[PDB]
Short mmCIF file of N, CA and C in Angstrom, two decimals:
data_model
loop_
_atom_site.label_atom_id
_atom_site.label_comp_id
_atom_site.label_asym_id
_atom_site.label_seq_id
_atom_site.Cartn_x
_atom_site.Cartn_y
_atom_site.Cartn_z
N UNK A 291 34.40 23.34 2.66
CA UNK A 291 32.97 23.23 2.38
C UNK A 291 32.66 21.91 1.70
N UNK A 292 31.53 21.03 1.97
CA UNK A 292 31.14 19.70 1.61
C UNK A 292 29.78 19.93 0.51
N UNK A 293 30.03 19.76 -0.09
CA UNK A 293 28.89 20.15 -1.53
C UNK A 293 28.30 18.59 -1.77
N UNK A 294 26.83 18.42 -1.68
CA UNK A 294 26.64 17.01 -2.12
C UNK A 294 25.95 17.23 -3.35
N UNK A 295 26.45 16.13 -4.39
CA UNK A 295 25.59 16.23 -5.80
C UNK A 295 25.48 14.79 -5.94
N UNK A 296 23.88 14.42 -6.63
CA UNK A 296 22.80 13.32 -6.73
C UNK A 296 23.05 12.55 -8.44
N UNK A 297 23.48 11.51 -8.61
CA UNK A 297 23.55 11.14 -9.81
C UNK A 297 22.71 9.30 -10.15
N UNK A 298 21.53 9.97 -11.07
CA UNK A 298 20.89 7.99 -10.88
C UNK A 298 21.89 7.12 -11.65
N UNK A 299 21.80 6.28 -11.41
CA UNK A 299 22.69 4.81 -11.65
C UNK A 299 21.75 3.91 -12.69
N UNK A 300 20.54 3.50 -11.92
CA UNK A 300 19.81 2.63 -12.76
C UNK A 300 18.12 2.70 -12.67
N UNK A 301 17.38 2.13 -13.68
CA UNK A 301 16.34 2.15 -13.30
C UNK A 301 15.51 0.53 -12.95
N UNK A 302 13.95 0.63 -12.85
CA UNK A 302 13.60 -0.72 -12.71
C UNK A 302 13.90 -1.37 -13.93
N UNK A 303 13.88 -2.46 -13.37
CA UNK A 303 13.52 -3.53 -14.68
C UNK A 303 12.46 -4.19 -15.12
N UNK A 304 11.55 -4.47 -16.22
CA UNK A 304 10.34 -4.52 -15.82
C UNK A 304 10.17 -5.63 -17.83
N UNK A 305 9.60 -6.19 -17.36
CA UNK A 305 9.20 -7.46 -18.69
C UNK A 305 7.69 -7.65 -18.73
N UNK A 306 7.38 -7.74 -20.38
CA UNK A 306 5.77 -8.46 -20.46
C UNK A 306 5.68 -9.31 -20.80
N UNK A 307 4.64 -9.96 -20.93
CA UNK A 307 4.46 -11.47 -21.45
C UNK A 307 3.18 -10.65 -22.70
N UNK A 308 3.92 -11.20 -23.56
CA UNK A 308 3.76 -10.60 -24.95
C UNK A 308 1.68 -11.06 -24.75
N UNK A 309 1.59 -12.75 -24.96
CA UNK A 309 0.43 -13.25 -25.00
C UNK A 309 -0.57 -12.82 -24.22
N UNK A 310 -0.05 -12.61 -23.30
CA UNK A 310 -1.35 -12.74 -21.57
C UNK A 310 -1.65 -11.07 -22.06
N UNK A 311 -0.83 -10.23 -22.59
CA UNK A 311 -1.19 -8.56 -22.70
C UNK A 311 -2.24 -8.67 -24.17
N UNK A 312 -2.16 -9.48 -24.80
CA UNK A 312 -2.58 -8.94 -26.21
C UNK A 312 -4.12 -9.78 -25.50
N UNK A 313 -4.03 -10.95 -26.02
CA UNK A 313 -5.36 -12.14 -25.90
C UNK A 313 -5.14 -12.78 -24.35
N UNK A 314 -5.59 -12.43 -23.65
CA UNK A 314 -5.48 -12.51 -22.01
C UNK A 314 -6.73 -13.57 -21.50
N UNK A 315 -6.36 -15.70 -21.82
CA UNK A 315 -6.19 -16.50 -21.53
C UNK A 315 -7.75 -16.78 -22.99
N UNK A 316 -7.53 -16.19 -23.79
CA UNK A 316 -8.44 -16.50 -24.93
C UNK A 316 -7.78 -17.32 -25.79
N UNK A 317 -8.34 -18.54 -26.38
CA UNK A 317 -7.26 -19.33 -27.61
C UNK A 317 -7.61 -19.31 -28.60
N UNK A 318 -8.74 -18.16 -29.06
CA UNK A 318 -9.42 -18.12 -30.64
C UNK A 318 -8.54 -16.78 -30.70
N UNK A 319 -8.15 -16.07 -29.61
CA UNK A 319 -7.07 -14.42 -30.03
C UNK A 319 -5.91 -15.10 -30.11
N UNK A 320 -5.24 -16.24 -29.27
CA UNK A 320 -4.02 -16.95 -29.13
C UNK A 320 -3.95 -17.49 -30.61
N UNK A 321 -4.77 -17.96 -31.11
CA UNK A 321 -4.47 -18.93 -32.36
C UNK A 321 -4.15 -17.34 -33.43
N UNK A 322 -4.47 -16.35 -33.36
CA UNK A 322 -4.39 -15.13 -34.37
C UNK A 322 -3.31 -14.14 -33.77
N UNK A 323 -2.98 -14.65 -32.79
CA UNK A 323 -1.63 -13.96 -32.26
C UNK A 323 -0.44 -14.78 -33.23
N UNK A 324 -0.60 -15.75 -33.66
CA UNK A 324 0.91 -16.18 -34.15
C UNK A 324 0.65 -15.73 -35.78
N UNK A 325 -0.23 -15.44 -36.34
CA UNK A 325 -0.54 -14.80 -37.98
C UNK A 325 0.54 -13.66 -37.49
N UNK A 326 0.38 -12.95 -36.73
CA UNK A 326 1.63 -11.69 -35.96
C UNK A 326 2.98 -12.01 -35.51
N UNK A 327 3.54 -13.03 -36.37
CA UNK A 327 4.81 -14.04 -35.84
C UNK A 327 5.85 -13.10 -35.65
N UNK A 328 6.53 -13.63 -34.77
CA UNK A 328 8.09 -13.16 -34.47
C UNK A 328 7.69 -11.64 -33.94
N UNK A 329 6.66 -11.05 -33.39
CA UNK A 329 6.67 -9.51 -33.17
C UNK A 329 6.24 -9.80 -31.55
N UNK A 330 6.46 -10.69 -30.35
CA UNK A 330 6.59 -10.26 -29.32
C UNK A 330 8.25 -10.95 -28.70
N UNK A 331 8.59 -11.98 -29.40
CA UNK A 331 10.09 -12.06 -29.49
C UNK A 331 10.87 -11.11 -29.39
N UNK A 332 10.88 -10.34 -30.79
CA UNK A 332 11.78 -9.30 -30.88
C UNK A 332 11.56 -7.66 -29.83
N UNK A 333 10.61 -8.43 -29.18
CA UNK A 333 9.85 -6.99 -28.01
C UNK A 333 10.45 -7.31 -27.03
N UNK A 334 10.27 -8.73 -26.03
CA UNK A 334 11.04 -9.69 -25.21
C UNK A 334 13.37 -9.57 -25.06
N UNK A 335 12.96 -9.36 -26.00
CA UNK A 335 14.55 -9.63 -26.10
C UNK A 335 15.21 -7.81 -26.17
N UNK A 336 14.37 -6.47 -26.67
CA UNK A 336 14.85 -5.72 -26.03
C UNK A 336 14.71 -5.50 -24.57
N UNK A 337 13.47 -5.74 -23.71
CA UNK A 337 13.53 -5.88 -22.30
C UNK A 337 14.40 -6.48 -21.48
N UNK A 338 14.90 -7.60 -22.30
CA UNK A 338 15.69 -8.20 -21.42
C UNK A 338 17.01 -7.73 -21.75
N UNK A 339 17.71 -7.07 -22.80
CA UNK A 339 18.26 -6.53 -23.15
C UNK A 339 18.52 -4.66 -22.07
N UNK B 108 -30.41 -6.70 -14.82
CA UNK B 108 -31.02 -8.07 -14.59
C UNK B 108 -31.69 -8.33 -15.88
N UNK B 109 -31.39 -9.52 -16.85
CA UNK B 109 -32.11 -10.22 -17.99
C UNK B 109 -33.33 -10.80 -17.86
N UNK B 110 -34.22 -10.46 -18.97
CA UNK B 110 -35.34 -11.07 -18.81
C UNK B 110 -35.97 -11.65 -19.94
N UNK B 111 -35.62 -11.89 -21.17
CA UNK B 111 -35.44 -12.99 -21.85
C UNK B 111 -34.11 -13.54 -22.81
N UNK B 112 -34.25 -15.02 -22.61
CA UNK B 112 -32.92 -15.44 -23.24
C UNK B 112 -33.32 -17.63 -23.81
N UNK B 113 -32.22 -17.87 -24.67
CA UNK B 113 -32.54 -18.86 -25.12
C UNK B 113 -32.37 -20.19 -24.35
N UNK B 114 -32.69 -21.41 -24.79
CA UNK B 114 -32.37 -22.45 -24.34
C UNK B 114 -31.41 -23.06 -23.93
N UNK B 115 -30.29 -22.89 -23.42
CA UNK B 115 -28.90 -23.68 -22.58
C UNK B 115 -29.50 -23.89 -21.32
N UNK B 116 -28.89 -25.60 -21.30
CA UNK B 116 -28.72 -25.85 -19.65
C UNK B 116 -27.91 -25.14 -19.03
N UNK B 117 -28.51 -25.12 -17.39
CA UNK B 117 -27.02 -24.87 -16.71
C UNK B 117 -26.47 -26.12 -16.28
N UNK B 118 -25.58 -25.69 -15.39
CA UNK B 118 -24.08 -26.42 -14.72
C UNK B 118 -23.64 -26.21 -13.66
N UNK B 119 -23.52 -27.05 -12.98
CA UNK B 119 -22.96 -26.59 -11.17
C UNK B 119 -21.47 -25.91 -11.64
N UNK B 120 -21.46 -25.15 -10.44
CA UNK B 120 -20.40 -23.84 -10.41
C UNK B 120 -19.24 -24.87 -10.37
N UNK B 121 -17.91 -24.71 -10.82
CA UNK B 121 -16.71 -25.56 -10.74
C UNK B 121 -15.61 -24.03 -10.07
N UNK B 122 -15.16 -24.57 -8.95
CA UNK B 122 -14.40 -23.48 -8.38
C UNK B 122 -12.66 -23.79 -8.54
N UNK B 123 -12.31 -22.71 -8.21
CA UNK B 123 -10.71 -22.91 -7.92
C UNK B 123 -9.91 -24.02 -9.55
N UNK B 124 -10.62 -23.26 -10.58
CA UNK B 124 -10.24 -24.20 -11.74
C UNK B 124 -10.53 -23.67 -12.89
N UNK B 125 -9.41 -23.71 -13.38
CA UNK B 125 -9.45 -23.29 -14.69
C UNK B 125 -10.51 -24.12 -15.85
N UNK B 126 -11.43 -23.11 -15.83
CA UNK B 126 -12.78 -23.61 -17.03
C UNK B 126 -13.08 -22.41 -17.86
N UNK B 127 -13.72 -22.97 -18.31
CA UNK B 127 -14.65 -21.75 -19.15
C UNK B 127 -15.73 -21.39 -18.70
N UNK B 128 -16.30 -20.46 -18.26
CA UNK B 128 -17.68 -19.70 -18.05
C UNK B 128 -18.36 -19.27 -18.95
N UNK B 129 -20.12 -19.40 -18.28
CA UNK B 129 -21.06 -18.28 -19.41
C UNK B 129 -22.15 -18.14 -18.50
N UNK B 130 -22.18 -16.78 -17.71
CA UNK B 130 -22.91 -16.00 -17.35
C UNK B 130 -24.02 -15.24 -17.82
N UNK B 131 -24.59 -15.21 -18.05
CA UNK B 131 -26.22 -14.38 -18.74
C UNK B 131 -25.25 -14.03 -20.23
N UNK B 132 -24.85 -15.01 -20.77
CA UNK B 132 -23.98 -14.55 -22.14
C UNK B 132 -22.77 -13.66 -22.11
N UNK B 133 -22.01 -14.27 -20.99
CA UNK B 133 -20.28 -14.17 -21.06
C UNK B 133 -19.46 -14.55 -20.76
N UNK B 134 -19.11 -14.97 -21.89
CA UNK B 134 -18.46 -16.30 -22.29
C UNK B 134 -17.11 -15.67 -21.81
N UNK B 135 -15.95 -16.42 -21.12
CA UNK B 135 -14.51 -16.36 -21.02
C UNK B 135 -14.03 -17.60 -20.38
N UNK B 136 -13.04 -17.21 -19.63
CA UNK B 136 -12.08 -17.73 -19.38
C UNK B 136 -10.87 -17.65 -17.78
N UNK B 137 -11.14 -18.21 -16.89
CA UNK B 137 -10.41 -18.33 -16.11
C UNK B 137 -10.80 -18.97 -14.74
N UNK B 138 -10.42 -19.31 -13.01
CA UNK B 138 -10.89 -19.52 -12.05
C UNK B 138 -11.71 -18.19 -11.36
N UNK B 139 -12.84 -19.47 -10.97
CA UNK B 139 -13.77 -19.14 -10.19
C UNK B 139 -13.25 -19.21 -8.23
N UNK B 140 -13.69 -17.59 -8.13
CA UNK B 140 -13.25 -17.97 -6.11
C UNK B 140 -15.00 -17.17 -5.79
N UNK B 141 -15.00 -17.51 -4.56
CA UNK B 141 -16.11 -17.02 -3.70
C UNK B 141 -15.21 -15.50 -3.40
N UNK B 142 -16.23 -14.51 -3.29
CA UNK B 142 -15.84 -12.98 -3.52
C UNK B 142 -16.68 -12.65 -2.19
N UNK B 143 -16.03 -11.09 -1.57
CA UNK B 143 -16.26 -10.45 -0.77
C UNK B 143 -16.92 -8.79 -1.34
N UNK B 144 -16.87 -9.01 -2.82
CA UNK B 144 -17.13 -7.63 -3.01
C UNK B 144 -19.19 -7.69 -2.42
N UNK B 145 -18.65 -5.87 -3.01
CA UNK B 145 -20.07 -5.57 -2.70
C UNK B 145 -20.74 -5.15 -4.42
N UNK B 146 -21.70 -5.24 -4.76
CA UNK B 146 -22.46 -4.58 -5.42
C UNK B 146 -24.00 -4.03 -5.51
N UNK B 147 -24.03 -3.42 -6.55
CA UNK B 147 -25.21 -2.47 -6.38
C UNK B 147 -26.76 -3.48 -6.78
N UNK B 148 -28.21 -3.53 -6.13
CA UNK B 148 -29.23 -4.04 -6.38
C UNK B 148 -29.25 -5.17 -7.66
N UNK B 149 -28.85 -3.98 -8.85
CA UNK B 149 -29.00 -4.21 -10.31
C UNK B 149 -27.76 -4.46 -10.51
N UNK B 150 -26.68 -4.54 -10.14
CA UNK B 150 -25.60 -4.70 -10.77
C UNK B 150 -25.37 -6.34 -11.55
N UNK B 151 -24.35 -6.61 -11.81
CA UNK B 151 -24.32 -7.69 -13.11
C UNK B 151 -22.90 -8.60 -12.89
N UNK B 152 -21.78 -7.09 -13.52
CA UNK B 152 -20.29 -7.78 -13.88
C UNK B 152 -20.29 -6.64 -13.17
N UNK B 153 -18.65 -6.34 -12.72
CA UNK B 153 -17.56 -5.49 -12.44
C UNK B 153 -16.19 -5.34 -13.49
N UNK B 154 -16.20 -4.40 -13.73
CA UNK B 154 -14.90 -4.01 -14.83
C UNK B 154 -13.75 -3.35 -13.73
N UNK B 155 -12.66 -3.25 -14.58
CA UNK B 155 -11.35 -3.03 -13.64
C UNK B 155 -11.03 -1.78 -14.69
N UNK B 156 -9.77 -1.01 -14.42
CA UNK B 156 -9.45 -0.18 -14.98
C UNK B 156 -8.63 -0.37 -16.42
#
């Protein structure tokens, strides 16, 4: 008898661009995005992770 | 449709280029293309989800 069993491997991979999601092509939200320093870095680097 | 508002000139349309816009007072940011949508009599802007 041939029994088949289904096991996932991986999923997508999928990245944001920290800036374009928060202040999306504004440079008075861009200039107050970096008062929020180092918090889409450390977001970036688990994704790519 | 607006029916009163203050003194600004306008400006010939600049296409396919990153500028700044201001439409009956809205102000942003990005390129202008010639569109196929449709809208309603009164309609204005279109929002996305």
């Amino acid at each position: 008898s041939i029994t088949t069993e289904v096991m996932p491997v991986s999923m997508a991979k999928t990245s944001v661009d920290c800036n374009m999601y928060i202040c999306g092509d504004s440079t008075e939200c861009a200039n107050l995005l970096l008062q929020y320093g180092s918090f889409c870095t450390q977001l970036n680097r688990a994704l790519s992770g | 449709p607006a029916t009163v508002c203050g003194p600004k000139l306008s400006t010939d349309l600049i296409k396919n280029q990153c500028v700044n816009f201001n439409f009956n007072g809205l102000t942003g940011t990005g390129v202008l293309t010639p569109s196929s949508k449709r809208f309603q009599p009164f309609q204005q802007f279109g929002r996305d989800v």
